[PDB]
Amino acid sequence: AGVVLQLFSHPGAGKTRAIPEYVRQLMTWSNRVYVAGPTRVVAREMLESLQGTKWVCAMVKLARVVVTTHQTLLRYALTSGLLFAKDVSYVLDETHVDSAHTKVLRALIHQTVCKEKSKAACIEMTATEVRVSMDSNYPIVDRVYNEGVVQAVRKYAETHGPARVAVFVPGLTGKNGALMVAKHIKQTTPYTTIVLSRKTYERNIKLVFKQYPRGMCVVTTSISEDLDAVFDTCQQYHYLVTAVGTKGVITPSTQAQTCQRRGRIGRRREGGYYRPANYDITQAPVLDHPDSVTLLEANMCLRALDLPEEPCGAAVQQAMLRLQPSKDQVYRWLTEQDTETLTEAMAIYSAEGGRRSREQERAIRNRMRSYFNDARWER
């Protein structure tokens, strides 16, 4: 019926087996079904796992079942009716991702599916009434290093022979930076280090797929979020709202973050998971750090569209008062999708959604720095 139905699916489960059955059960009452997942690789995985299902079309930026990503579905539902329709059901995978677009998308699918006179449903599936699924296809062994991540990867390199291994590191730089640890692993273990960041994902990813015999060590930021073990810093590089703007800080990753970083190893093979002893899984934030700037941009959009908002910190509530985009400023952001920050979209799109002059664009961003200093306008 017109209902939203969560399904707690463990990370990398035999979802493939189950999603084609959900699409045909939704062809009961509705005429199209949209399938979306965070990154493109999941969208291709979903496309693969629907191979034998007749009228299936992809949307990677007539038909009856579209698969695409969270982002470019949002970009589409907003530009082409869709939400005014009553015969479109949705299936969303990895609803627990830390993107503002997933958040607003979830709200809009919820609105158009529980709508009055609706004849469509939604199926949400996540690895996170407070529950986090830590099951996998194969068993996973949880261990604890007390002495640092590099040295626990040395212990592993010698106690075990070469394996495929991966290290989840907060930032590209720092004393625990991807660059910094890869050099130290390079110079100790016989493993070859493949660094993966958004800054370098596209070039090195190719390198990741060869069979490395002396050993392979993926040192990765959260973009990566097939191998035999995972070493977790249990730390991330959020940007956070600080009441003068935003600042970049290292944080204990959220329960949902580590649940996905772990969920990389148990899918096709036994795997081991190494977290630091001094990490409070019980006590870290479940889904989002209380005042992360992703929770600001999501609520900013949700308020303009007069949708239900998300639990957030006090510094965000404060910031949602200094910064109040209009329905169309957040449409232009969500639909032309060439400004990473909603804050900067407010500089280039007027209150009515039209493009601003060059001198108007520059006046507004300087005025905005008087009260909100977004530190993402640099790096």
Residue numbers in the entry: 338 to 398, 406 to 472, 480 to 576, 582 to 735
Report text from the authors:
ALSV belongs to the distinct Jingmenvirus group within the Flaviviridae family with segmented RNA genomes. While segments 2 and 4 of the ALSV genome encode the VP1–VP3 proteins of unknown origin, segments 1 and 3 encode the NS2b–NS3 and NS5 proteins, which are related to Flavivirus nonstructural proteins, suggesting an evolutionary link between segmented and unsegmented viruses within the Flaviviridae family. Here, the enzymatic activity of the ALSV NS3-like helicase (NS3-Hel) was characterized and its crystal structure was determined to 2.9 Å resolution. ALSV NS3-Hel exhibits an ATPase activity that is comparable to those measured for Flavivirus NS3 helicases.
D1 and D2 are tandem RecA-like domains with an α/β fold. The proteolytic products were present in the crystals and their proportion was clearly increased in comparison with the sample before crystallization. This result indicates that the missing C-terminal portion of the D3 domain might be owing to proteolytic cleavage that occurred during purification despite the presence of a high concentration of proteinase inhibitor (see Section 2). All conserved SF2 helicase motifs are located in the cleft formed between the D1 and D2 domains. We found that the residues involved in the recognition of NTP, hydrolysis intermediates, catalytic water and metal ion are invariant in ALSV NS3-Hel, which suggests that the catalytic mechanism underlying ATP hydrolysis is conserved in the NS3-Hels from segmented viruses. While most of the catalytic residues of ALSV NS3-Hel superimpose well with their equivalents in ZIKV NS3, the P-loop of ALSV NS3-Hel adopts a different conformation.
